[PDB]
Design a binder for this molecule. Structure first.
Ligand SMILES: [Zn+2]
Ligand SMILES: [Zn+2]
Ligand SMILES: [Zn+2]
Length: 133
DNA sequence: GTGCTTCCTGCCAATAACG
DNA sequence: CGTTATTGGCAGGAAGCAC
């Protein structure tokens, strides 16, 4: 067991721009609009927590970067098109497909795709993957 | 330039600590 | 369920690598 603490540290600095408070990493002076985003980033400098793969000996500095890489190892077709029903492994291939085949914008107000949960590997499952209508 | 893969980062929900 | 602190999954393209 360890003694819990509820304190901040000098691992960043604040910079006010156009009224907005930004948070900046001390090492590389990268700016962030959210502290949550900054904390995620600082793990790339500290290497306090490693995120090693299962199928190879590779290590990532972020949990989500590992997960997305492992989705490419397993081949989980998360993104399904709704126009032609075709399934894709990530957003980048899906967007390219919808543009080249259907000549439509998935970031528009049509919504021509649906996201299915990942079952090939273990992750937290948001209630919008479970069932939405 | 075309094609494959990983990185960036605000946004949002989930986890943990304390009541 | 209400605050404080961090994890870490999502959208969507830019950047890097291969040709
Ligand atoms: Zn930094
Ligand atoms: Zn791997
Ligand atoms: Zn389609």
């Amino acid at each position: 067991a360890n003694k819990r603490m509820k304190v901040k540290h000098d691992d960043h600095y604040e910079l006010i721009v156009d009224g907005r408070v930004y948070y900046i990493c001390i090492v590389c002076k990268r700016s962030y609009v959210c502290l949550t985003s900054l904390r995620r980033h600082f793990n790339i400098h500290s290497w306090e927590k490693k995120y090693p793969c299962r199928y190879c000996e590779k290590v990532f500095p972020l949990a989500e970067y590992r997960t997305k890489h492992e989705i490419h190892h397993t081949g989980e077709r998360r993104y399904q098109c709704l126009a032609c029903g075709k399934s894709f492994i990530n957003y980048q291939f899906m967007s390219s497909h919808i543009k080249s085949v259907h000549s439509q914008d998935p970031s528009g107000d049509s919504k021509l795709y649906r996201l299915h949960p990942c079952r090939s590997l273990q992750i937290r499952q948001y209630a919008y993957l479970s069932d939405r209508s």
